[PDB]
Design a protein around this ligand. Structure first.
Ligand SMILES: C=C(C)[C@@H]1CCC(C)=C[C@H]1c1c(C)cc(O)cc1O
Length: 139
């Protein structure tokens, strides 16, 4: 039984600028965005999952029910919205973001004290890893 609940600090973020370039994000914002090291605050409450991606530059909040398609507003990231479904795939969480772009989604799992997050679009792959932390900040 995987439970993603916790607070997590970014350790690595690989190939994020190419991921954003594939989303047609402009180069100035790609640089700004790749300097950011957001935290993740996750509360898993039955099939109700809240994933808060937190930084001083911006927060992006996901709040959904596993297995239920919903409209995800990503216009602050790439000026697009998607019809998104998050599903359990073994011990992994699989997200498919249907919309203008082909093959858009991500995959999340836990290894030890690491939260692993692979995000993808148009065959471009960005891999992030976060470490579980215990010192909390208000937000
Ligand atoms: C909402 C935030 C913090 C920013 C907002 C601007 C862009 C273009 C991406 C977002 C982002 C996300 C979603 C995740 C991430 O690891 C790094 C980022 O920069």
């Amino acid at each position: 039984p995987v439970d993603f609940t916790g607070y997590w600090k970014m350790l690595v973020n690989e190939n994020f600028e190419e991921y954003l370039r594939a989303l047609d994000v402009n180069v100035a914002l790609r640089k700004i965005a790749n300097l950011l090291k957001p935290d993740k605050e996750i509360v898993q409450d039955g099939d109700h999952m809240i994933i808060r991606t937190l930084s001083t530059f911006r927060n992006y909040i996901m709040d959904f029910q596993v297995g239920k398609e919903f409209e995800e507003d990503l216009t602050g990231i790439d000026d697009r919205k998607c019809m998104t479904t998050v599903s359990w795939d073994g011990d992994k969480l699989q997200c498919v973001q249907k919309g203008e772009k082909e093959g858009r989604g991500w995959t999340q799992w836990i290894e030890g004290d690491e939260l692993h997050l692979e995000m993808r679009v148009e065959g471009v792959v960005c891999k992030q890893v976060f470490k579980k932390v215990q010192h909390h900040h208000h937000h």
